[PDB]
Amino acid sequence: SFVEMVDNLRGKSGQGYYVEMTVGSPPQTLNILVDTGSSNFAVGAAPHPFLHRYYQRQLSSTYRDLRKGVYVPYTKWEGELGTDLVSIPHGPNVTVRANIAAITESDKFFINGSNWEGILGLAYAEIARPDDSLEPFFDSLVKQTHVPNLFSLQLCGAGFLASVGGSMIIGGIDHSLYTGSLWYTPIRREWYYEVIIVRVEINGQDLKMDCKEYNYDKSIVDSGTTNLRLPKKVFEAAVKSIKAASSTEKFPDGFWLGEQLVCWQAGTTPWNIFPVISLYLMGEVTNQSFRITILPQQYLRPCYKFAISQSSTGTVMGAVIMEGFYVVFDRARKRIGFAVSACHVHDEFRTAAVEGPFVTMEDCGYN
Ligand SMILES: COc1ccc([C@]2([C@]34C[C@H]5C[C@H](C[C@H](C5)C3)C4)N=C(N)N(C)C2=O)cc1C
C-alpha cells in the first residue's frame, strides 16, 4: 500500500530530501538522501564532524566484506565496498541485500545540518563507482523482490533552514499525489536519467535556440541537485529574459548569480513581476512534445535565493523543478512521467502546469 509511503521524505531547504532507511542486523537507522543523479548506495561509516550517526559495520551480523576499496574525487569521498541487509521502514515491506559503499573518509561531501548520513543513488549502473559491475540499490531491490521496476517522487518543498517534505513511492504510482494527466518523456539512455528538452519559453516567449543547446551536453533529472541548472548559453538567455520581465524592480548581480539573497517581508513578495518558465520535453512520439511550466515560487527558494544557475555539464532539472510536479521514473518502460503535484505551491493567478501535446526533434539530442 502506497499510503504508508506518503510523506516518507523530509529535508532542509537546499540540502536535499532524505528517506529513513535501516542497514545491518540489528537494524541501524540512517537518513539517506534520495539521489536520482547518482548510482551508489553510499553511507557514512566512520565519525565525521557533520555526522551525528553513522553505519557501523562491526555492529552488523549480516555484513559481508567485498574486500574492495573505492575512491571518488570530484569538484571527494572514499570507502570500502561490502553488502548488508537494507530496508526502508516507510517503503516496500521487504529487505534486500544491497551493495554498500562505506564512506570512511570524505572532503566537502556531507552537509552540515542536513540531517542525512548517506546517499541512495537511484540512477543506473553505467555511472556507478568504481564501475558498472557494482549493482545499484534499486536494481538489487527489483531483482530480489517482486517490486515493479518503477518509482515516483513528489517533492513538496516548504511553502507558506525551512523544513521540506515529500513522498517516494517505490514500485508504483500514487494517483492521490497528482492531478490531471501524466505526460512521459523518453529516457534517452540508461545511465543518468537523461531526457531531451525540445524547446523553452519564458513568459510565453520562445528563447529561439537550436534545441541541441538545451541538451548540451546532456539533460538529466536529478533530485540530488537543488537548482535548475542550464548550459552557459541557455542560462544567459534565460536570465536576460527574466531580468527584463522583472524590470520594474532591479536586483544586485550577486542575486542573479545565486549568491546574494533578496528580501521582502511577510507576503509582500511581488511574484507577479517574475515570469513563468516552460520546458518542453520530447514526447513518446517523435515530433510531439509536452511542457512543464514552473512558477517563480519554484525558482526563488526561501528572503529568497535565485535557484537558477549555470552548468558546464548540461541541463540539470533539479529539486526546485521537480517540486512543482509528481515525477515518475518508469524504468520498466524507459520513460519519465510528469504530472501536476497535489502539493505544488502557487498563487491565485498562475499555477505550475503539465500540458500536451505540442508538435515540434530526435536531433535535439547532443550525442
Ligand atoms: C558516487 O559519487 C557521488 C554521488 C552523488 C553526488 C551528488 C551529491 C554530492 C554531495 C552534494 C549533493 C548531495 C550529496 C553530497 C550527493 C550532491 N549527487 C548529485 N546528484 N550530484 C550532482 C552530486 O554531485 C556526487 C558524487 C561524486
Side-chain angles (χ1 to χ4, degrees), residues 65-112:
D65 202 351
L66 284 168
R67 290 99 54 75
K68 189 181 307 180
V70 51
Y71 173 62
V72 188
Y74 62 90
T75 289
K76 69 95 176 66
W77 72 269
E78 42 189 295
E80 311 181 339
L81 298 183
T83 71
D84 209 339
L85 305 186
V86 184
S87 304
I88 307 168
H90 305 279
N93 180 32
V94 297
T95 301
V96 300
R97 172 164 293 278
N99 284 318
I100 306 175
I103 312 173
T104 51
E105 165 63 332
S106 63
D107 179 22
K108 277 174 288 179
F109 181 78
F110 301 111
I111 303 174
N112 187 30

mmCIF file of all heavy atoms in Angstrom, residues 65-112:
data_model
loop_
_atom_site.group_PDB
_atom_site.id
_atom_site.type_symbol
_atom_site.label_atom_id
_atom_site.label_comp_id
_atom_site.label_asym_id
_atom_site.label_seq_id
_atom_site.Cartn_x
_atom_site.Cartn_y
_atom_site.Cartn_z
ATOM 1 N N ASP A 65 32.088 -8.352 3.731
ATOM 2 C CA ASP A 65 33.122 -7.538 3.104
ATOM 3 C C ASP A 65 33.378 -7.976 1.661
ATOM 4 O O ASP A 65 33.556 -9.166 1.387
ATOM 5 C CB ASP A 65 34.410 -7.664 3.921
ATOM 6 C CG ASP A 65 35.359 -6.509 3.698
ATOM 7 O OD1 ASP A 65 35.109 -5.701 2.791
ATOM 8 O OD2 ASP A 65 36.359 -6.407 4.439
ATOM 9 N N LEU A 66 33.394 -7.021 0.735
ATOM 10 C CA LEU A 66 33.718 -7.327 -0.653
ATOM 11 C C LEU A 66 35.221 -7.208 -0.905
ATOM 12 O O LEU A 66 35.690 -7.445 -2.019
ATOM 13 C CB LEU A 66 32.937 -6.430 -1.625
ATOM 14 C CG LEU A 66 31.459 -6.764 -1.852
ATOM 15 C CD1 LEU A 66 30.741 -5.634 -2.585
ATOM 16 C CD2 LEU A 66 31.289 -8.081 -2.602
ATOM 17 N N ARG A 67 35.970 -6.860 0.140
ATOM 18 C CA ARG A 67 37.413 -6.657 0.024
ATOM 19 C C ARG A 67 37.731 -5.854 -1.228
ATOM 20 O O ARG A 67 38.393 -6.343 -2.137
ATOM 21 C CB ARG A 67 38.163 -7.993 -0.024
ATOM 22 C CG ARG A 67 38.179 -8.763 1.280
ATOM 23 C CD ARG A 67 37.118 -9.850 1.294
ATOM 24 N NE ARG A 67 37.233 -10.736 0.137
ATOM 25 C CZ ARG A 67 38.172 -11.665 -0.005
ATOM 26 N NH1 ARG A 67 39.093 -11.832 0.934
ATOM 27 N NH2 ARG A 67 38.196 -12.426 -1.092
ATOM 28 N N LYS A 68 37.245 -4.621 -1.274
ATOM 29 C CA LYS A 68 37.451 -3.771 -2.430
ATOM 30 C C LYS A 68 37.218 -2.326 -2.021
ATOM 31 O O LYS A 68 36.188 -1.996 -1.430
ATOM 32 C CB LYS A 68 36.501 -4.173 -3.559
ATOM 33 C CG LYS A 68 36.777 -3.499 -4.888
ATOM 34 C CD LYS A 68 35.770 -3.932 -5.947
ATOM 35 C CE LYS A 68 35.701 -5.447 -6.058
ATOM 36 N NZ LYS A 68 34.715 -5.884 -7.085
ATOM 37 N N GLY A 69 38.192 -1.472 -2.309
ATOM 38 C CA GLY A 69 38.085 -0.066 -1.975
ATOM 39 C C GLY A 69 37.408 0.697 -3.094
ATOM 40 O O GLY A 69 37.128 0.147 -4.155
ATOM 41 N N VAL A 70 37.135 1.972 -2.857
ATOM 42 C CA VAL A 70 36.541 2.815 -3.881
ATOM 43 C C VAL A 70 36.860 4.272 -3.586
ATOM 44 O O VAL A 70 36.642 4.754 -2.479
ATOM 45 C CB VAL A 70 35.017 2.582 -4.006
ATOM 46 C CG1 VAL A 70 34.345 2.664 -2.643
ATOM 47 C CG2 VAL A 70 34.404 3.574 -4.976
ATOM 48 N N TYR A 71 37.410 4.962 -4.576
ATOM 49 C CA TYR A 71 37.844 6.337 -4.390
ATOM 50 C C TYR A 71 37.164 7.240 -5.404
ATOM 51 O O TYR A 71 37.279 7.030 -6.612
ATOM 52 C CB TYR A 71 39.370 6.437 -4.502
ATOM 53 C CG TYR A 71 39.888 7.856 -4.480
ATOM 54 C CD1 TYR A 71 39.681 8.675 -3.377
ATOM 55 C CD2 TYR A 71 40.584 8.380 -5.565
ATOM 56 C CE1 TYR A 71 40.149 9.972 -3.352
ATOM 57 C CE2 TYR A 71 41.059 9.679 -5.546
ATOM 58 C CZ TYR A 71 40.835 10.471 -4.438
ATOM 59 O OH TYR A 71 41.302 11.766 -4.415
ATOM 60 N N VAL A 72 36.445 8.245 -4.914
ATOM 61 C CA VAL A 72 35.664 9.096 -5.799
ATOM 62 C C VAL A 72 35.936 10.583 -5.602
ATOM 63 O O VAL A 72 35.225 11.255 -4.851
ATOM 64 C CB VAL A 72 34.155 8.831 -5.643
ATOM 65 C CG1 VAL A 72 33.380 9.582 -6.721
ATOM 66 C CG2 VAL A 72 33.877 7.337 -5.721
ATOM 67 N N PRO A 73 36.961 11.104 -6.294
ATOM 68 C CA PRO A 73 37.283 12.533 -6.272
ATOM 69 C C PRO A 73 36.390 13.284 -7.252
ATOM 70 O O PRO A 73 35.925 12.695 -8.228
ATOM 71 C CB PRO A 73 38.732 12.580 -6.772
ATOM 72 C CG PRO A 73 39.059 11.181 -7.261
ATOM 73 C CD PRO A 73 37.802 10.375 -7.255
ATOM 74 N N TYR A 74 36.164 14.566 -6.984
ATOM 75 C CA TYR A 74 35.362 15.430 -7.846
ATOM 76 C C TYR A 74 35.601 16.888 -7.454
ATOM 77 O O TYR A 74 36.532 17.180 -6.707
ATOM 78 C CB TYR A 74 33.877 15.076 -7.739
ATOM 79 C CG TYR A 74 33.295 15.265 -6.356
ATOM 80 C CD1 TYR A 74 32.729 16.477 -5.981
ATOM 81 C CD2 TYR A 74 33.311 14.233 -5.425
ATOM 82 C CE1 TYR A 74 32.197 16.657 -4.724
ATOM 83 C CE2 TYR A 74 32.777 14.406 -4.157
ATOM 84 C CZ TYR A 74 32.222 15.619 -3.816
ATOM 85 O OH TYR A 74 31.690 15.805 -2.559
ATOM 86 N N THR A 75 34.759 17.795 -7.954
ATOM 87 C CA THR A 75 34.894 19.235 -7.695
ATOM 88 C C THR A 75 36.351 19.707 -7.621
ATOM 89 O O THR A 75 36.975 19.683 -6.554
ATOM 90 C CB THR A 75 34.138 19.672 -6.413
ATOM 91 O OG1 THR A 75 32.726 19.606 -6.646
ATOM 92 C CG2 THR A 75 34.503 21.103 -6.029
ATOM 93 N N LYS A 76 35.422 15.200 -2.053
ATOM 94 C CA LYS A 76 35.565 13.831 -2.529
ATOM 95 C C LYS A 76 35.152 12.847 -1.450
ATOM 96 O O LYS A 76 34.950 13.228 -0.292
ATOM 97 C CB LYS A 76 37.008 13.566 -2.956
ATOM 98 C CG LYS A 76 38.007 13.526 -1.813
ATOM 99 C CD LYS A 76 38.258 12.101 -1.344
ATOM 100 C CE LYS A 76 39.337 12.047 -0.271
ATOM 101 N NZ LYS A 76 38.904 12.722 0.988
ATOM 102 N N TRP A 77 35.018 11.579 -1.825
ATOM 103 C CA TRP A 77 34.753 10.542 -0.839
ATOM 104 C C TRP A 77 35.385 9.223 -1.248
ATOM 105 O O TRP A 77 35.401 8.870 -2.423
ATOM 106 C CB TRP A 77 33.248 10.368 -0.597
ATOM 107 C CG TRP A 77 32.490 9.714 -1.726
ATOM 108 C CD1 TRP A 77 31.870 10.341 -2.771
ATOM 109 C CD2 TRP A 77 32.251 8.313 -1.906
ATOM 110 N NE1 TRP A 77 31.271 9.416 -3.594
ATOM 111 C CE2 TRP A 77 31.490 8.165 -3.084
ATOM 112 C CE3 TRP A 77 32.615 7.167 -1.191
ATOM 113 C CZ2 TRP A 77 31.086 6.918 -3.561
ATOM 114 C CZ3 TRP A 77 32.211 5.935 -1.665
ATOM 115 C CH2 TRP A 77 31.455 5.820 -2.836
ATOM 116 N N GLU A 78 35.919 8.507 -0.267
ATOM 117 C CA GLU A 78 36.464 7.179 -0.494
ATOM 118 C C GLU A 78 35.894 6.228 0.543
ATOM 119 O O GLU A 78 35.536 6.641 1.642
ATOM 120 C CB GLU A 78 37.988 7.200 -0.420
ATOM 121 C CG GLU A 78 38.536 8.042 0.717
ATOM 122 C CD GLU A 78 40.040 8.205 0.632
ATOM 123 O OE1 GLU A 78 40.754 7.191 0.764
ATOM 124 O OE2 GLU A 78 40.508 9.345 0.428
ATOM 125 N N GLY A 79 35.800 4.955 0.190
ATOM 126 C CA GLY A 79 35.180 3.997 1.078
ATOM 127 C C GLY A 79 35.531 2.563 0.764
ATOM 128 O O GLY A 79 36.345 2.282 -0.111
ATOM 129 N N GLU A 80 34.900 1.650 1.486
ATOM 130 C CA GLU A 80 35.131 0.237 1.281
ATOM 131 C C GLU A 80 33.827 -0.429 0.900
ATOM 132 O O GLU A 80 32.770 -0.113 1.448
ATOM 133 C CB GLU A 80 35.697 -0.379 2.554
ATOM 134 C CG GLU A 80 36.849 0.427 3.107
ATOM 135 C CD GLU A 80 37.443 -0.176 4.353
ATOM 136 O OE1 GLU A 80 36.750 -0.978 5.015
ATOM 137 O OE2 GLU A 80 38.606 0.157 4.662
ATOM 138 N N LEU A 81 33.903 -1.345 -0.053
ATOM 139 C CA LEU A 81 32.710 -1.995 -0.556
ATOM 140 C C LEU A 81 32.342 -3.195 0.296
ATOM 141 O O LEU A 81 33.205 -3.940 0.759
ATOM 142 C CB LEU A 81 32.882 -2.396 -2.030
ATOM 143 C CG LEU A 81 33.116 -1.237 -3.007
ATOM 144 C CD1 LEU A 81 33.212 -1.728 -4.450
ATOM 145 C CD2 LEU A 81 32.030 -0.177 -2.867
ATOM 146 N N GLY A 82 31.044 -3.357 0.513
ATOM 147 C CA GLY A 82 30.508 -4.513 1.201
ATOM 148 C C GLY A 82 29.059 -4.688 0.797
ATOM 149 O O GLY A 82 28.535 -3.919 -0.006
ATOM 150 N N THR A 83 28.418 -5.714 1.337
ATOM 151 C CA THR A 83 26.979 -5.865 1.210
ATOM 152 C C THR A 83 26.396 -6.041 2.604
ATOM 153 O O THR A 83 27.104 -6.456 3.529
ATOM 154 C CB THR A 83 26.592 -7.065 0.331
ATOM 155 O OG1 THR A 83 26.891 -8.285 1.014
ATOM 156 C CG2 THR A 83 27.341 -7.032 -0.996
ATOM 157 N N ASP A 84 25.119 -5.706 2.755
ATOM 158 C CA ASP A 84 24.396 -5.921 4.007
ATOM 159 C C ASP A 84 22.902 -5.835 3.726
ATOM 160 O O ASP A 84 22.484 -5.487 2.613
ATOM 161 C CB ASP A 84 24.801 -4.899 5.072
ATOM 162 C CG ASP A 84 24.657 -5.440 6.489
ATOM 163 O OD1 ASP A 84 23.897 -6.410 6.684
ATOM 164 O OD2 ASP A 84 25.302 -4.892 7.409
ATOM 165 N N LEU A 85 22.093 -6.164 4.725
ATOM 166 C CA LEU A 85 20.650 -6.136 4.555
ATOM 167 C C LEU A 85 20.181 -4.705 4.713
ATOM 168 O O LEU A 85 20.603 -4.008 5.635
ATOM 169 C CB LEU A 85 19.957 -7.054 5.562
ATOM 170 C CG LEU A 85 20.449 -8.509 5.556
ATOM 171 C CD1 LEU A 85 19.613 -9.386 6.490
ATOM 172 C CD2 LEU A 85 20.447 -9.070 4.140
ATOM 173 N N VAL A 86 19.331 -4.264 3.791
ATOM 174 C CA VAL A 86 18.831 -2.898 3.806
ATOM 175 C C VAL A 86 17.317 -2.909 3.745
ATOM 176 O O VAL A 86 16.727 -3.734 3.045
ATOM 177 C CB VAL A 86 19.380 -2.074 2.627
ATOM 178 C CG1 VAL A 86 18.920 -0.615 2.740
ATOM 179 C CG2 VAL A 86 20.893 -2.152 2.584
ATOM 180 N N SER A 87 16.692 -2.007 4.501
ATOM 181 C CA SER A 87 15.254 -1.833 4.452
ATOM 182 C C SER A 87 14.898 -0.353 4.428
ATOM 183 O O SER A 87 15.720 0.511 4.731
ATOM 184 C CB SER A 87 14.573 -2.496 5.651
ATOM 185 O OG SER A 87 14.909 -3.866 5.725
ATOM 186 N N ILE A 88 13.660 -0.082 4.050
ATOM 187 C CA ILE A 88 13.094 1.251 4.106
ATOM 188 C C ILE A 88 11.800 1.093 4.877
ATOM 189 O O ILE A 88 10.806 0.621 4.320
ATOM 190 C CB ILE A 88 12.778 1.786 2.702
ATOM 191 C CG1 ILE A 88 14.014 1.697 1.800
ATOM 192 C CG2 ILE A 88 12.248 3.219 2.785
ATOM 193 C CD1 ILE A 88 13.724 1.929 0.326
ATOM 194 N N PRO A 89 11.817 1.458 6.173
ATOM 195 C CA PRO A 89 10.682 1.290 7.087
ATOM 196 C C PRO A 89 9.378 1.848 6.526
ATOM 197 O O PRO A 89 8.322 1.226 6.676
ATOM 198 C CB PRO A 89 11.103 2.097 8.322
ATOM 199 C CG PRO A 89 12.599 2.063 8.299
ATOM 200 C CD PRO A 89 12.990 2.049 6.843
ATOM 201 N N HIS A 90 9.446 3.017 5.901
ATOM 202 C CA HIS A 90 8.258 3.597 5.295
ATOM 203 C C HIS A 90 8.317 3.430 3.787
ATOM 204 O O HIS A 90 8.110 4.380 3.038
ATOM 205 C CB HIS A 90 8.115 5.065 5.696
ATOM 206 C CG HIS A 90 8.120 5.274 7.177
ATOM 207 N ND1 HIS A 90 7.001 5.082 7.959
ATOM 208 C CD2 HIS A 90 9.115 5.625 8.026
ATOM 209 C CE1 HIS A 90 7.302 5.325 9.220
ATOM 210 N NE2 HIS A 90 8.580 5.655 9.288
ATOM 211 N N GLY A 91 8.605 2.204 3.358
ATOM 212 C CA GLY A 91 8.712 1.874 1.948
ATOM 213 C C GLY A 91 8.102 0.514 1.691
ATOM 214 O O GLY A 91 7.180 0.104 2.391
ATOM 215 N N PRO A 92 8.603 -0.202 0.674
ATOM 216 C CA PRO A 92 8.042 -1.541 0.487
ATOM 217 C C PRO A 92 8.351 -2.393 1.710
ATOM 218 O O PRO A 92 9.356 -2.153 2.379
ATOM 219 C CB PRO A 92 8.784 -2.066 -0.754
ATOM 220 C CG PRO A 92 9.989 -1.161 -0.899
ATOM 221 C CD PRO A 92 9.507 0.171 -0.429
ATOM 222 N N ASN A 93 7.493 -3.358 2.014
ATOM 223 C CA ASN A 93 7.736 -4.225 3.157
ATOM 224 C C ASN A 93 8.655 -5.396 2.808
ATOM 225 O O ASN A 93 8.263 -6.559 2.905
ATOM 226 C CB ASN A 93 6.420 -4.728 3.749
ATOM 227 C CG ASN A 93 6.633 -5.636 4.938
ATOM 228 O OD1 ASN A 93 7.593 -5.474 5.695
ATOM 229 N ND2 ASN A 93 5.742 -6.608 5.106
ATOM 230 N N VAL A 94 9.878 -5.077 2.399
ATOM 231 C CA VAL A 94 10.864 -6.098 2.067
ATOM 232 C C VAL A 94 12.237 -5.732 2.603
ATOM 233 O O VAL A 94 12.469 -4.618 3.067
ATOM 234 C CB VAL A 94 10.993 -6.313 0.544
ATOM 235 C CG1 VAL A 94 9.688 -6.821 -0.042
ATOM 236 C CG2 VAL A 94 11.431 -5.031 -0.138
ATOM 237 N N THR A 95 13.149 -6.692 2.535
ATOM 238 C CA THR A 95 14.529 -6.453 2.904
ATOM 239 C C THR A 95 15.391 -7.085 1.825
ATOM 240 O O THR A 95 15.153 -8.221 1.415
ATOM 241 C CB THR A 95 14.837 -7.024 4.312
ATOM 242 O OG1 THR A 95 13.976 -6.397 5.272
ATOM 243 C CG2 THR A 95 16.279 -6.755 4.711
ATOM 244 N N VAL A 96 16.361 -6.331 1.324
ATOM 245 C CA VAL A 96 17.209 -6.833 0.258
ATOM 246 C C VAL A 96 18.663 -6.712 0.658
ATOM 247 O O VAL A 96 19.022 -5.854 1.465
ATOM 248 C CB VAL A 96 16.985 -6.061 -1.065
ATOM 249 C CG1 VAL A 96 15.539 -6.187 -1.518
ATOM 250 C CG2 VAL A 96 17.377 -4.594 -0.905
ATOM 251 N N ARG A 97 19.498 -7.587 0.105
ATOM 252 C CA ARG A 97 20.925 -7.469 0.309
ATOM 253 C C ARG A 97 21.461 -6.577 -0.788
ATOM 254 O O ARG A 97 21.353 -6.890 -1.976
ATOM 255 C CB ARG A 97 21.608 -8.838 0.278
ATOM 256 C CG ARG A 97 23.130 -8.754 0.286
ATOM 257 C CD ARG A 97 23.778 -10.090 0.636
ATOM 258 N NE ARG A 97 23.528 -10.499 2.016
ATOM 259 C CZ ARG A 97 24.220 -10.068 3.067
ATOM 260 N NH1 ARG A 97 25.213 -9.200 2.908
ATOM 261 N NH2 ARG A 97 23.917 -10.501 4.281
ATOM 262 N N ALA A 98 22.021 -5.446 -0.389
ATOM 263 C CA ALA A 98 22.428 -4.451 -1.356
ATOM 264 C C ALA A 98 23.886 -4.123 -1.175
ATOM 265 O O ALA A 98 24.445 -4.293 -0.091
ATOM 266 C CB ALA A 98 21.577 -3.184 -1.210
ATOM 267 N N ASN A 99 24.502 -3.656 -2.248
ATOM 268 C CA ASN A 99 25.842 -3.119 -2.169
ATOM 269 C C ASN A 99 25.821 -1.875 -1.302
ATOM 270 O O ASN A 99 24.878 -1.084 -1.356
ATOM 271 C CB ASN A 99 26.353 -2.778 -3.564
ATOM 272 C CG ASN A 99 26.771 -4.014 -4.344
ATOM 273 O OD1 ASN A 99 27.407 -4.911 -3.794
ATOM 274 N ND2 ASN A 99 26.420 -4.061 -5.626
ATOM 275 N N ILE A 100 26.858 -1.712 -0.495
ATOM 276 C CA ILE A 100 27.005 -0.519 0.312
ATOM 277 C C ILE A 100 28.442 -0.042 0.206
ATOM 278 O O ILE A 100 29.368 -0.799 0.470
ATOM 279 C CB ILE A 100 26.689 -0.816 1.799
ATOM 280 C CG1 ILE A 100 25.306 -1.458 1.930
ATOM 281 C CG2 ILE A 100 26.797 0.453 2.639
ATOM 282 C CD1 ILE A 100 24.954 -1.900 3.339
ATOM 283 N N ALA A 101 28.630 1.205 -0.191
ATOM 284 C CA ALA A 101 29.944 1.815 -0.098
ATOM 285 C C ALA A 101 30.005 2.480 1.263
ATOM 286 O O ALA A 101 29.255 3.413 1.532
ATOM 287 C CB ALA A 101 30.142 2.843 -1.198
ATOM 288 N N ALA A 102 30.874 1.977 2.135
ATOM 289 C CA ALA A 102 31.012 2.539 3.469
ATOM 290 C C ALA A 102 32.036 3.666 3.454
ATOM 291 O O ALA A 102 33.241 3.422 3.440
ATOM 292 C CB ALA A 102 31.418 1.460 4.457
ATOM 293 N N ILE A 103 31.547 4.902 3.457
ATOM 294 C CA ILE A 103 32.413 6.076 3.421
ATOM 295 C C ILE A 103 33.213 6.202 4.712
ATOM 296 O O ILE A 103 32.647 6.449 5.773
ATOM 297 C CB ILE A 103 31.603 7.375 3.229
ATOM 298 C CG1 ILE A 103 30.596 7.218 2.085
ATOM 299 C CG2 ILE A 103 32.541 8.556 3.000
ATOM 300 C CD1 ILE A 103 29.643 8.391 1.935
ATOM 301 N N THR A 104 34.527 6.043 4.615
ATOM 302 C CA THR A 104 35.393 6.126 5.789
ATOM 303 C C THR A 104 36.139 7.458 5.839
ATOM 304 O O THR A 104 36.572 7.894 6.904
ATOM 305 C CB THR A 104 36.393 4.949 5.844
ATOM 306 O OG1 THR A 104 37.073 4.835 4.586
ATOM 307 C CG2 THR A 104 35.659 3.653 6.119
ATOM 308 N N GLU A 105 36.280 8.103 4.687
ATOM 309 C CA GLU A 105 36.848 9.446 4.630
ATOM 310 C C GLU A 105 36.271 10.242 3.460
ATOM 311 O O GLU A 105 35.954 9.685 2.410
ATOM 312 C CB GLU A 105 38.377 9.399 4.564
ATOM 313 C CG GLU A 105 39.041 10.714 4.154
ATOM 314 C CD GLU A 105 38.807 11.858 5.137
ATOM 315 O OE1 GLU A 105 37.771 11.867 5.842
ATOM 316 O OE2 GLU A 105 39.667 12.766 5.193
ATOM 317 N N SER A 106 36.132 11.546 3.655
ATOM 318 C CA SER A 106 35.496 12.406 2.671
ATOM 319 C C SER A 106 35.924 13.854 2.868
ATOM 320 O O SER A 106 36.451 14.222 3.919
ATOM 321 C CB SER A 106 33.967 12.287 2.768
ATOM 322 O OG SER A 106 33.493 12.731 4.034
ATOM 323 N N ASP A 107 35.691 14.668 1.847
ATOM 324 C CA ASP A 107 36.030 16.083 1.882
ATOM 325 C C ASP A 107 34.915 16.872 1.207
ATOM 326 O O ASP A 107 34.652 16.686 0.024
ATOM 327 C CB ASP A 107 37.360 16.324 1.162
ATOM 328 C CG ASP A 107 37.764 17.787 1.152
ATOM 329 O OD1 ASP A 107 37.288 18.549 2.021
ATOM 330 O OD2 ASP A 107 38.561 18.175 0.272
ATOM 331 N N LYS A 108 34.251 17.740 1.966
ATOM 332 C CA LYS A 108 33.151 18.538 1.425
ATOM 333 C C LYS A 108 32.076 17.684 0.750
ATOM 334 O O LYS A 108 31.511 18.079 -0.270
ATOM 335 C CB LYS A 108 33.676 19.595 0.444
ATOM 336 C CG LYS A 108 34.194 20.857 1.116
ATOM 337 C CD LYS A 108 34.832 21.807 0.113
ATOM 338 C CE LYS A 108 36.170 21.274 -0.380
ATOM 339 N NZ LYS A 108 36.803 22.182 -1.382
ATOM 340 N N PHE A 109 31.793 16.518 1.322
ATOM 341 C CA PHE A 109 30.764 15.639 0.777
ATOM 342 C C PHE A 109 29.489 15.746 1.607
ATOM 343 O O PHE A 109 28.413 16.066 1.088
ATOM 344 C CB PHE A 109 31.267 14.192 0.729
ATOM 345 C CG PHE A 109 30.270 13.219 0.162
ATOM 346 C CD1 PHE A 109 30.065 13.131 -1.208
ATOM 347 C CD2 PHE A 109 29.543 12.386 0.998
ATOM 348 C CE1 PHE A 109 29.148 12.236 -1.728
ATOM 349 C CE2 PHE A 109 28.628 11.488 0.483
ATOM 350 C CZ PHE A 109 28.428 11.413 -0.881
ATOM 351 N N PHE A 110 29.615 15.482 2.904
ATOM 352 C CA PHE A 110 28.494 15.625 3.819
ATOM 353 C C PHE A 110 28.198 17.098 4.065
ATOM 354 O O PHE A 110 29.093 17.943 3.991
ATOM 355 C CB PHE A 110 28.782 14.921 5.147
ATOM 356 C CG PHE A 110 29.068 13.454 5.004
ATOM 357 C CD1 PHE A 110 30.338 12.956 5.244
ATOM 358 C CD2 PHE A 110 28.067 12.572 4.632
ATOM 359 C CE1 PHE A 110 30.606 11.609 5.117
ATOM 360 C CE2 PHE A 110 28.331 11.220 4.502
ATOM 361 C CZ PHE A 110 29.599 10.741 4.744
ATOM 362 N N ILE A 111 26.937 17.396 4.361
ATOM 363 C CA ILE A 111 26.491 18.766 4.563
ATOM 364 C C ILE A 111 26.148 19.006 6.026
ATOM 365 O O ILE A 111 25.391 18.242 6.635
ATOM 366 C CB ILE A 111 25.263 19.081 3.695
ATOM 367 C CG1 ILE A 111 25.587 18.838 2.219
ATOM 368 C CG2 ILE A 111 24.800 20.514 3.919
ATOM 369 C CD1 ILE A 111 24.391 18.979 1.304
ATOM 370 N N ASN A 112 26.721 20.064 6.589
ATOM 371 C CA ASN A 112 26.452 20.426 7.972
ATOM 372 C C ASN A 112 24.968 20.688 8.199
ATOM 373 O O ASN A 112 24.380 21.571 7.570
ATOM 374 C CB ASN A 112 27.271 21.652 8.381
ATOM 375 C CG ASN A 112 27.144 21.970 9.862
ATOM 376 O OD1 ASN A 112 26.942 21.077 10.688
ATOM 377 N ND2 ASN A 112 27.263 23.249 10.204
#
